Design a protein around this ligand. Structure first.
Ligand SMILES: [Fe+3]
Ligand SMILES: [Fe+3]
Lengths: 279, 288
């Protein structure tokens, strides 16, 4: 797929010297939406969630999901796509996206600081996380699918999965706590973060649709099926599922994976419906 | 380059250039002043959506030909005349956050200039000619030689950060000021209002680079700091009221150089150097 280096969105825009007129109104609308959705960690009121955080099986599940969010990913890819996509509308969106991932990361840190007041507990939790069978699986999948050896199209599809598939079970877990009306700053920041992550997903699906040379159906399905297994491996397995049904969560993960496929222009492969009408 | 080769050989093990190995989370905050800058930036967030140019277009059409030509060239210079590189080079989390935010904000400045240019220069052909015309002026070529000398993969980080401070602190200082000259005439509100937002952002960017420089154990010789800064002034003087003469327009070229020298001295002393120009700010409207 790499021999197609004649892609227009991967080609330098010599003919253009300023932003207007807008050449890609649809990718520009996504930038305008991200910009208008901007929020800071300051909007999270935490005080009334530490009294609220203070059962013991829930406490344990939360500490581990926060630690996962904060520490699960190894060694930047919004920055890669910022460098290699050439259209200004797309450069703007990826650069805004790096600053929003940073707000996400800060918000998880802040949550962590509030929930685990003890620096010793917290360091112990970060070390024991950094060895989980789900953290290793993720790194294998990234190793495989986010190479400089890979095509831009495989990388864009893999990006779509990091945004739309990975973490979707932990987002769901926290939505289950919201359905229960518990832990209000966690569930509030979770719904903002999850909202951003959905925009980031549709945006890569949009970039992928600007490509004249798309992947074979089979290759898209491989990438996605594998991201599913990585995701299966955490929220009801490496960390046991405390009032949630493990099997129904597998179906929800598979449901978001099919939805991404549709979005990437491929057939569903799981045919799972959404088990949770609360999502 | 003797003073540069000794500087790099020393930055081997600068704190802020060394991986945070024993850090795993943002809290507790290890650099509270770097953090404070990030929070101020983020609290300052604004977008080009807040700029409206309807009043401006009425004003612009009343302007004489000299003033229109002056405005078009200043805009075209702003539009087309490395936070991403500092993002990667500084290793501390609070600074990385600031730099990444800075990219998004500078993108907003760029969009704002694109918007101004689309409204002020509705003709696509004259725009095209404007941009082709400025790519050639000495002032752009002066800009590029200074930048090729002081910002390269060969430099010492300390050099690059003082250059970076001049880019924000000194370059465009004259065009910012010239736009405030128009505000003083109660004209072109979109232009002057987005000008104060963007000018205020560059102030914050300048001070942050001064802070970062202060976090270095190994400082540059004052003589190197002064050369960077004198050369940047010369770059800035070569455009505003030289490549684009302002006197015909009611402005004063001689006070313009004096104002740029004032800004430069304020940078040096922010970088912990003695002033070298001793120029005072000639313009009562430029901090008021
Ligand atoms: Fe994201
Ligand atoms: Fe700046």
């Amino acid at each position: 797929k790499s021999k197609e280096a004649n892609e227009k969105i991967l080609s330098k825009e010599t003919d253009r010297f300023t932003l207007y007129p807008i050449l890609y109104p649809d990718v520009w609308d996504f930038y305008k939406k991200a910009e208008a959705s901007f929020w800071t960690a300051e909007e999270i009121d935490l005080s009334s969630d530490l009294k609220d955080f203070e059962n013991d099986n829930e406490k344990h599940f939360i500490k581990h999901v926060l630690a996962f969010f904060a520490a699960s990913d190894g060694i930047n890819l919004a920055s890669k796509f910022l460098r290699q996509v050439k259209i200004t509308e797309a450069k703007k969106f990826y650069a805004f996206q790096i600053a929003v991932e940073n707000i996400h990361s800060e918000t998880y840190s802040l949550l962590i600081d509030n929930y685990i007041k003890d620096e010793k507990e917290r360091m112990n939790l970060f070390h024991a996380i950094e060895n989980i069978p789900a953290v290793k699986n993720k790194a294998l999948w990234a190793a495989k699918w986010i190479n400089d050896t890979n095509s831009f199209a495989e990388r864009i599809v893999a990006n779509a999965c990091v945004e739309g598939i990975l973490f979707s079970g932990s987002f769901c877990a926290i939505f289950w706590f919201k359905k229960q009306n518990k832990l209000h700053g966690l569930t509030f920041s979770n719904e903002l973060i999850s909202r951003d992550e959905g925009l980031h997903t549709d945006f890569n699906c949009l970039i992928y649709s600007l490509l004249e040379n798309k992947l074979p159906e089979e290759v898209v399905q491989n990438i996605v099926k594998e991201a599913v297994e990585v995701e299966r491996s955490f929220i009801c397995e490496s960390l046991p599922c405390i009032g949630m049904n493990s099997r129904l969560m597998s179906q929800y993960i598979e449901f978001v994976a099919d939805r991404l496929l549709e979005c990437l222009g491929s057939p569903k492969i799981f045919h799972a419906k959404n088990p949770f009408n609360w999502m």
